[PDB]
Amino acid sequence: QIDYRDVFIEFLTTFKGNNNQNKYIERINELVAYRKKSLIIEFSDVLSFNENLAYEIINNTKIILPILEGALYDHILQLDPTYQRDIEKVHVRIVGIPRVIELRKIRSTDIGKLITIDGILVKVTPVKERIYKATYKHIHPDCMQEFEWPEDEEMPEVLEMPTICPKCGKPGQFRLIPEKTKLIDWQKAVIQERPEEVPSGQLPRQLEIILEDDLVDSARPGDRVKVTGILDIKQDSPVKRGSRAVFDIYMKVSSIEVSSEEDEKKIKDLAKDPWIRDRIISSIAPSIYGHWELKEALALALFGGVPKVLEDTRIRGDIHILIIGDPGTAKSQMLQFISRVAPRAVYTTGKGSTAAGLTAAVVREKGTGEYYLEAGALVLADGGIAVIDEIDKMRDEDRVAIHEAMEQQTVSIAKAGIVAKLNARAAVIAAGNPKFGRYISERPVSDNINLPPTILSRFDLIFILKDQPGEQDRELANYILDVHSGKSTKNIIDIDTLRKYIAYARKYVTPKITSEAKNLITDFFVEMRKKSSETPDSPILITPRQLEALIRISEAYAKMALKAEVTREDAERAINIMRLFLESVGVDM
Amino acid sequence: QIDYRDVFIEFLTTFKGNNNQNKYIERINELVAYRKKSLIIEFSDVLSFNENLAYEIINNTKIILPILEGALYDHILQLDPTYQRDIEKVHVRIVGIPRVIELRKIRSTDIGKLITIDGILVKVTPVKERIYKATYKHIHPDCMQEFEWPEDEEMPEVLEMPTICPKCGKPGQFRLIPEKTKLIDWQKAVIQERPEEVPSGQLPRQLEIILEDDLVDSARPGDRVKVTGILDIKQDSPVKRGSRAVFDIYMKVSSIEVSSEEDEKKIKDLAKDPWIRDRIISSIAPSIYGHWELKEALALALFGGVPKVLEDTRIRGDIHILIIGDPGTAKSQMLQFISRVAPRAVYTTGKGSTAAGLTAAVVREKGTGEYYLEAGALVLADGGIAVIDEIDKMRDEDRVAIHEAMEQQTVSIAKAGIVAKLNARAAVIAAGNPKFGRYISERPVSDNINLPPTILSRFDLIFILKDQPGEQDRELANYILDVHSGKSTKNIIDIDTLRKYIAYARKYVTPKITSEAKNLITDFFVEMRKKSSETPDSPILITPRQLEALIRISEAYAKMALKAEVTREDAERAINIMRLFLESVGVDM
DNA sequence: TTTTTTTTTTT
Ligand SMILES: [Mg+2]
Ligand SMILES: [Mg+2]
Ligand SMILES: [Zn+2]
Ligand SMILES: [Zn+2]
Structure with missing residues (x-):
């Protein structure tokens, strides 16, 4: 019953953070600058400052928030009267609630209480x-x-x-x-439980959440989010009794977090090491022995090149990788690792996907009777990575649907009276097997690959993996048994901080091409084209796409070290990795 | 008439267990300690204690359960006052009801009476x-x-x-x-009558059951359950009568059990015998003469290896077996035995199954028009065994759908705007015929098997069965006629005991590899690769998967004797069985 | 009718 408005005000005005800069007065300072009518407060901070204040929010959230929000509004008006006539009400969002409940463990006792749920956003409706x-x-x-x-x-x-x-x-x-x-603005979304917590032999469950006012359009499908709010029973057709006094539950969102400064200097410290590139490569799939050239190629695809947008056209900046190998060469294990370390990635298989499911699907709502578009795997992976395992198992009539998405990075639909064009700027990493399961060295490359040259030309790098039992079997066997015994490689960048490093690099680093790098790339391309003319039977063609592959790879190498420009050293590395690609497919220079 | 609350409390505090240790007093504090708010009792014990109390429960269930609930709740409050304000009601569940009725024999006379039904769970709805x-x-x-x-x-x-x-x-x-x-929590499930109970030439019947409060999520689809409760008529759509005074029936579940200390002593007593491994193998398909190496291989797949979950990847722990043989070699009979003895198994046929039905199917819900997921056979068999008879009869374009689920143990779907990943951690046992029905010795092994090398490398062991008439025909004929004469082989573990043994072993035994076993396994694997490279024509490839097969087989042998370590003896057995597999496919060692 | 994934008969 004690008045907490005074406690809140002194907590906001007087608070000391870890950085010792009074963190919570700058947030309100920017509140009036941009008029965002929403303040974020951590539960750990309020608990440390006042244990009693933190508890009252947890259990009396229904009748403490309007009073707490009303107190903040008066303080803002005192700071600046101009906030009046622009914002009528200001919302206070509380995060970090210790009451975290799994999506499958929600029971009747949790109705009406402030809880937090971690899951995946799968569906979003337009704002109403x-x-x-x-x-x-x-x-x-x-x-x-x-x-x-x-x-x-x-x-x-x-x-x-x-x-x-x-x-x-x-x-x-x-x-x-x-x-x-x-x-008031209104939006509806669906949250699905993470695959980690799904019980054996069961399908994942879904929960409906409601976003209102400034929380609308705060996330996109496929994101991993944490949502805090109050559960409630859902009423849809109360007029029709129809027996069955059984209701479904939904969640009124009070705050949402999508999955800081201490990370910046941690990333900057890593980039200062002259051998940072080797450390990153050594950190890719630590459980896999050997395959150093493949690990280097996969690292490049994670960072990618620099897209170019011009007045009349745009140039693809993503890097595509294709791997062909004998069964048991750990192709699938590395792809699984990539789907985990990438900040945004979608994992698909060749057999379990269709043309509509990969790009876009036209679905007819039975109620209204009209058609509308549904985002495919490549559209959802825009700005991220798309992994397509077992690509050789796809039907050729169905695989050609991704030809334009791989190069033009767009999806074109002309179906059922719908004409549309969607962005699909996603990198594609694929793996498959040769025509006869394993590579036959007694036959030409033409009949071993069994893929049209149109799709092969779209891949920046192609590696043919051969399982040759030689003298390295003992080393491979010892490494595998050590993994099974719990032994772990040391001096590697862990997956969590590696993910942050890639996200930072792809956002703030835009390398530039220097004059000396241009000469090296130009000379190499001329020799590459000249050498290809010797053998015209190969299904691998050296097109102008290969020249742009060199540019993209060179930029990716510079982006790894957080450099602002492409030097001759990065160009030399790009030529070296391209040489290994050519040797694998049988082109020797 | 009289109150049995004093008797009920006295019965709880004075009943004697098998060792007269008061098997009911220690359940009360376990209920209090974990706040499980649900206590179960046995009808046989109540009848053995007081006949009058048992009848009142069995007959006046609707007017005595709340009375016993109140008496038990008071006894809890005096035992621990902290139980108050956390649990406002405690349920007491009675099991072992003598009133057991088949699902097809339910009539109007049984409505309103406490009965028990044994069946198979098929459908479960989300909790509401x-x-x-x-x-x-x-x-x-x-x-x-x-x-x-x-x-x-x-x-x-x-x-x-x-x-x-x-x-x-x-x-x-x-x-x-x-x-x-x-x-109050509410869940709806559907139960189906057992296949052995269905009358000739008719489809199985189904019953609707309702689970409430703590009984929700008590079982998964495909389980075998015994449900006890009251039958009642179902009122679903009473808004418009439309004549039709006919109603369906449903069951309000009061107690549910799926599929113990005395069993544990029996299981541990069995493991004391030094020849437990040979005794277990002799109990696999007792009605089949010969095929000792096959029975040993099938026993290993029942136990499996130790799955390894690391911070960056996971390793398969299941064992896959493939059997190719001439018709009439008892392949199907042995596979049928595995279904009965396995704690959880799914039996499928190559011709009677589709790609969508094996892994996952995307179906359009008729009520709303929205696509959703349906679990396939492999998903439903997670943590168990999947049996695929006549694998050679599947279309090759359709059989490739299980390649991902057999190594990565996951199912990936990208169809109609749905992107999802499901766990399919199950062991696969498959049987089939050679290309020409019978094995042809003149032709090589490659054209006889008629399977791609990709699927072959997924199988830990492959056995080729040849039906060669010889001097052993008389022994086989005598054995078969004895089976038809009712004579039964003795000194074999019964199927019910064997199932409990396997379930216990798979849950409490995690063998670890010692240094001695590592040296033996490494030496043998290197020897395979050298020998395989000498004859680069066989359809069997010695990939790194074969090395992991040895580790999994070694762990299974140790787990068969409930050993916590993999000594050198288990390694020798694993090497020996692998040698027979290689000799079967014509790879000498 | 229309696009979609599915099992099915029949174009
Ligand atoms: Mg693979
Ligand atoms: Mg058969
Ligand atoms: Zn009134
Ligand atoms: Zn009026």
């Missing part, structure tokens, strides 16, 4: 409007009266029309007045 | 909430009053709204108040 205070007109020739229907109370989830006119006490018909009605 | 006590507000400008609608009575299965406001006696509008409403 919700009525919380309506205005009605009594259509009865004596009344012609206006009144806000829900008195001293907001409109509930179910819309209700007055039965007795409050202005005259008589029944009749009432007409809604949209211009005098108060609205 | 059911209102048992509502709160309404009369929306009439004079009332604004809140009240609990169902007075001194639980809310019926049909949601009924008050017609006359009790607080004012007038009709009008009533608004539900979710905050003051009381809810």
Whole structure:
């Protein structure tokens, strides 16, 4: 019952952070600068500053937030009166609630309490409007009266029309007045439980969440998020009894976090090592022995090149990798690692996917009867990585649907009266087997690969993996048994901080091509084209795409070391890795 | 008539277990310590203690369960006052009801009586909430009053709204108040009668059951369960009568069991015998003469290896077996035995299965038009065994759908806007015929098997069965006729005991590899690779998967004797069985 | 009719 508004104000005005800069007065300082009407407060900080204040938020959230938010509004007005007439209400979002519940473990005892759920966002609806205070007109020739229907109370989830006119006490018909009605932004989304916590032999569960006001459009499908709010039962058709007094539950979101400064200097410290590139390569799939050239190639695809956008066209900046190898060469294990270390990645298989599922699907809503688009795997992976294992098992009639997405990075649909064009700027990493399961060295490369030259030309690097039992079997066997015994390689960058390093590099580093790098690349391309003319039977063609592959690889090498430009050393590395690619496919220079 | 609360409390505190250790007193504090709020009792023990109490439970169940619930709750409160304010109600569940009725024999006379049904779980719905006590507000400008609608009575299965406001006696509008409403967990499941119970020439029948409160998520689809509770008629759509006074029936589950200390002593006693391994093998398919190497291989697949989960990857722990043989070699009979003895197994046929049915199917829900996922055979067999008879009859373009699930143990779907990943950690045992029905010795091994090298490398062991008539025909004929004469082989572990032994071993034994075993395995693997490279024509490739097969087989041998370590003896057995596999496919060693 | 994934008969 003690007044916490004074406690809140002194907590906000007077607080010391780890950096010792009064973290919580700069947030409100920027609150009036951009007028974002939302403040983020950590539960750990409020608990340390005042244990009693933190508890009251947890258990009395229903009737402490409006008072707490109202106190903050007055303080903001005192700081700057100009905030008036621009923002009427300010929301306070609390994160870091210790009450974390698994999606499958929610029971009746958790209804009405502030909890946190970690999951995957799978579906988002367009932003709509919700009525919380309506205005009605009594259509009865004596009344012609206006009144806000829900008195001293907001409109509930179910819309209700007055039965007795409050202005005259008589029944009749009432007409809604949209211009005098108060609205609020409304959005609906679906959260799916992570695959880690799904029990054996069961399908993942889903929960419906509601985003309102400034929380709308705060995430995109496929994101991993943490949501905090209050559970409640869902009402859809209360008018129709139809027996079955059984209801589903939904969650009213109060705050959302999508999965800091101490990371910046940690990343900067790593980039200062002259051997940072070797450390990153050694950290790719530590459980796999050998395959150093493949690990280097996979590292390049994670960083990628620099896309170019011009007045009349744009140039692809992503790097595509294709691996062909004998069974048991750990191709799938490395692809699994890539899907985990990448900040955004989608893992698909050749057999378990279709053309519609990879790019876009036209689906007809049975209710309304109209068609609309559904995002495919490549569209969802925009700005990230797409992994397509067992690509050779795809039907050729179905695999050609990704030809334009691989180069033009767009998806074109002309179906059922829908003409659309969606961005699909995603890198593609694929693996497969030769025509006869294992590579036959007694036959040409033409019949071993069994892939059209059109798709082969789209891959920046192609590596043919041969399982040759030689003298390295003992070393390989010892390494595998050590892995099974729990022994782990040391002096490697762990997956968590490696993910942060890639995300930072892809966002703030844009290397530039220097004059000396241009000469090395130009000379190499001329020799590459000249050497290819010797053997025209090979299904590998040296097209101008290969020249742009060298440019992209050179930029990726510079991006690994966080350099701002491409020097001759990065160009030399790009030529070296390209040489190994050519040797594998049988082109020797 | 009389109150048995004193008897019930006395029975709980005075009953004697098998060792007269009061097998019921230590359950009470376990209930208190973990706040499980659910206690189970055995009907045989209650009948053995007091005959009168057992009859009252078996007959007056609906008017004695709340009475015993209140008495037990009071005994808990005095034992520990902290139990209050955390659990407001404790349920007591009775099992072992003598009233057992087949699913097909239920008649109107059994309605309203405590019965028990044994069947197979097929469908389970997500957990929902059911209102048992509502709160309404009369929306009439004079009332604004809140009240609990169902007075001194639980809310019926049909949601009924008050017609006359009790607080004012007038009709009008009533608004539900979710905050003051009381809810209870609610789940719906479907049970099917056992295949051995279905009459000739008819489809199996199904029954709908309801699980509430702590009984939710008590089992997974495909389980064998025994459900006890009260039958009742189902009221689903009472809005419009439409004549049809006919109703279905459903069951309110009171206690559910799936599929112990005395068994543990029996299991541990068996493991003391030095020849337990040979004794177990002799118990595999006792009606089949010969095929000793096959029975040993099948025994290993039942136990499996030790899966390894690391911070960056996971390693398969299951063992896959492939059998190719001439018709009439008892391949199907042995596979049928594995289904009966395995704690969890799924039996499929190559011709009677599809790619979508094996892994996962995307289906359009008719009510809403939205696509959703359906679990396939491999997903339903997670943590168990999947049997695929007549694998050679599958279309090759359709058989490749299980390549991912057999090594990575995952199912990936990218179809119709759905991207998902599912766990399929199951062991695969497959059988089939050679290319020409019977094995042809003139032709090589490559054209006889007629399978791609990719699928062959996935199998830990491959055995080729040749039906060669010889001097052993008389022994085989005598054995078969003895089986038809009713004579049974003795000194074999019964199937029920063997199933318990395997389930215990797979849950509590995790063997570890010693230094001595590592040296033996490494030497043998190197020897395979050298020998394989000498004859680069066989359809069997010695990939690194073969090395991991040796580790998995060695762990299975140790797990078969409940050993915590993999000594050198288990390594020799693993090497020996692998030698026979190589000789079968014509690879000499 | 229309696009989609599925099992099925029949174009
Ligand atoms: Mg693979
Ligand atoms: Mg058969
Ligand atoms: Zn009026
Ligand atoms: Zn009233």
